[PDB]
Design an enzyme around this catalytic site. Structure first.
Site, PDB file in Angstrom:
ATOM      1  N   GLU A  11      -4.640  10.894  -3.164  1.00  0.00           N
ATOM      2  CA  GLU A  11      -3.931   9.994  -4.095  1.00  0.00           C
ATOM      3  C   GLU A  11      -3.049   8.938  -3.435  1.00  0.00           C
ATOM      4  O   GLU A  11      -2.758   7.906  -4.053  1.00  0.00           O
ATOM      5  CB  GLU A  11      -3.101  10.814  -5.101  1.00  0.00           C
ATOM      6  CG  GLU A  11      -3.942  11.647  -6.071  1.00  0.00           C
ATOM      7  CD  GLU A  11      -4.883  10.826  -6.974  1.00  0.00           C
ATOM      8  OE1 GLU A  11      -4.873   9.553  -6.982  1.00  0.00           O
ATOM      9  OE2 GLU A  11      -5.643  11.470  -7.701  1.00  0.00           O
ATOM     10  N   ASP A  20      -4.483   2.088 -10.365  1.00  0.00           N
ATOM     11  CA  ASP A  20      -5.341   3.062  -9.680  1.00  0.00           C
ATOM     12  C   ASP A  20      -6.793   2.544  -9.610  1.00  0.00           C
ATOM     13  O   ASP A  20      -7.070   1.382  -9.966  1.00  0.00           O
ATOM     14  CB  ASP A  20      -5.240   4.449 -10.338  1.00  0.00           C
ATOM     15  CG  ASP A  20      -5.967   4.545 -11.690  1.00  0.00           C
ATOM     16  OD1 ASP A  20      -6.609   3.577 -12.172  1.00  0.00           O
ATOM     17  OD2 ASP A  20      -5.892   5.642 -12.295  1.00  0.00           O
TER      18      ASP A  20
HETATM   19  C1  LIG Z   1      -1.645   4.502  -2.893  1.00  0.00           C
HETATM   20  C2  LIG Z   1      -1.543   3.096  -3.505  1.00  0.00           C
HETATM   21  O1  LIG Z   1      -0.990   2.197  -2.517  1.00  0.00           O
HETATM   22  C3  LIG Z   1      -0.892   0.862  -2.829  1.00  0.00           C
HETATM   23  C4  LIG Z   1      -1.401   0.318  -4.021  1.00  0.00           C
HETATM   24  C5  LIG Z   1      -1.265  -1.048  -4.275  1.00  0.00           C
HETATM   25  C6  LIG Z   1      -0.636  -1.875  -3.348  1.00  0.00           C
HETATM   26  C7  LIG Z   1      -0.142  -1.340  -2.159  1.00  0.00           C
HETATM   27  C8  LIG Z   1      -0.272   0.023  -1.900  1.00  0.00           C
HETATM   28  O2  LIG Z   1       0.221   0.545  -0.736  1.00  0.00           O
END
Ligand SMILES: CCOc1ccccc1O
Ligand SMILES: CCOc1ccccc1O
Length: 162
Positions: A11, A20
């Protein structure tokens, strides 16, 4: 390895609202806020979950608190589900973690589509279960994660998570 470390790998960790893999607003360690396309609606859900005006940002401790609640809720849900409970109880602890992982990602609704896999898992026909699990929207949309979870069901080991 355990279910917390496993889900943390699958995740990730992000302290600001993000979308997501399905395009839904999420924060922390896979904490789904809402399926609404409204960022404002997601900010509201966040504040409600944390108990303060967050403005879309949380701390690592807060992320972990939601995560612990989400894992607990996933397991408790399995145990209250008459279809899932007997299969879950039939498994060893490693394979139980694979089960929790799936429910965490797709919910009980999502795993409803897996009747034939569930039967093969209760029968301990591991290779057959593994083949059946991959014949799914889930596998196609998140193949790398699905392969890890499937390997865990197949082997009852943590090999896919190094
Ligand atoms: C685990 C989700 O990480 C990100 C999502 C969107 C932008 C930068 C992130 O580090
Ligand atoms: C295919 C989904 O596997 C499970 C999910 C929830 C509880 C037990 C399971 O074997």
């Amino acid at each position: 390895m355990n279910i917390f470390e496993m889900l943390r790998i699958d995740e990730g960790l992000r302290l600001k609202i993000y979308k997501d893999t399905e395009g839904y607003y999420t924060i922390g360690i896979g904490h789904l806020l809402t399926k609404s396309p409204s960022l404002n609606a997601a900010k509201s859900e966040l504040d409600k979950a944390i108990g303060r005006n967050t403005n879309g940002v949380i701390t690592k401790d807060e992320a972990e608190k939601l995560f612990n609640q989400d894992v607990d809720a996933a397991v408790r849900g399995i145990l209250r589900n008459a279809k899932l409970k007997p299969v879950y109880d039939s498994l060893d602890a490693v394979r139980r973690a694979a089960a929790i992982n799936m429910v965490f990602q797709m919910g009980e609704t999502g795993v409803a589509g897996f009747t034939n896999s569930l039967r093969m898992l209760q029968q301990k026909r591991w290779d057959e279960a593994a083949v059946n699990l991959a014949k799914s929207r889930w596998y196609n949309q998140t193949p790398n994660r699905a392969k890890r979870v499937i390997t865990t069901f197949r082997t009852g080991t943590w090999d896919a998570y190094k």
